[PDB]
Amino acid sequence: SQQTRVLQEKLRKLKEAMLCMVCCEEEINSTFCPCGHTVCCESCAAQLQSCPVCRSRVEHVQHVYLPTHTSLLNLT
Amino acid sequence: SQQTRVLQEKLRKLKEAMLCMVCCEEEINSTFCPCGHTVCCESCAAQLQSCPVCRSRVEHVQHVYLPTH
Ligand SMILES: O=C(N[C@H]1CCCNC1)c1ccccc1
Ligand SMILES: [Zn+2]
Ligand SMILES: [Zn+2]
Ligand SMILES: [Zn+2]
Ligand SMILES: [Zn+2]
Numbered sequence A: 001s002q003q004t005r006v007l008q009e010k011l012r013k014l015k016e017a018m019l020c021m022v023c024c025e026e027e028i029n030s031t032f033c034p035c036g037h038t039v040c041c042e043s044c045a046a047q048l049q050s051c052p053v054c055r056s057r058v059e060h061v062q063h064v065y066l067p068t069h070t071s072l073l074n075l076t
Numbered sequence B: 001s002q003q004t005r006v007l008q009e010k011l012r013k014l015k016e017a018m019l020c021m022v023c024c025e026e027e028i029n030s031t032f033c034p035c036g037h038t039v040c041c042e043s044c045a046a047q048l049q050s051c052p053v054c055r056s057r058v059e060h061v062q063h064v065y066l067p068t069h
Helices: A002-016 B002-017 B042-046
Strands: A030-033 A060-063 B030-033 B060-063
Touching (some): A002 B002, B030 B042
Antiparallel strands (some): A030 A060, B030 B060
16 A cells, blocks of 8 residues: 555665665664764774764774664674 | 555564663663673663673763664
8 A cells, every 4th residue: 555655665764774874885883982973884984083974083983783783794 | 455564563673673672762872882782772871880781891881873863
């Protein structure tokens, strides 16, 4: 039905919001510290000197284990 | 249709996975450091001396700003 199409769109958008803002391919699993922005996968977070969202200096990156993780890279 | 019910269940489970594992009421927005388990809201994370997933000592809590918030 049309309701099925609406729910499919909601699911798609929620899943897309969990993807890295730089490569758009890998799940977000890294936090820039101390600002807290959690918007990148490990590879894209590795070489940024400043946060791509707020421009704060990145002192270090903290890996995050989220219950929503489903990709092979985060389960293996 | 039956697919509407299946999609409602998938959406409910994904939304539930974003809720605090302790209180089940607030969105996850905190990481236990250094282990990295990100499973609580700030109020439950403040009250735990040990990670509720791996039992490692919590040295400090890092707030996380997620695009899904
Ligand atoms: O009351 C709040 N949190 C509680 C609700 C019940 C579950 N444990 C946390 C709350 C959260 C954010 C800002 C202000 C108040
Ligand atoms: Zn990436
Ligand atoms: Zn930032
Ligand atoms: Zn909580
Ligand atoms: Zn832990």
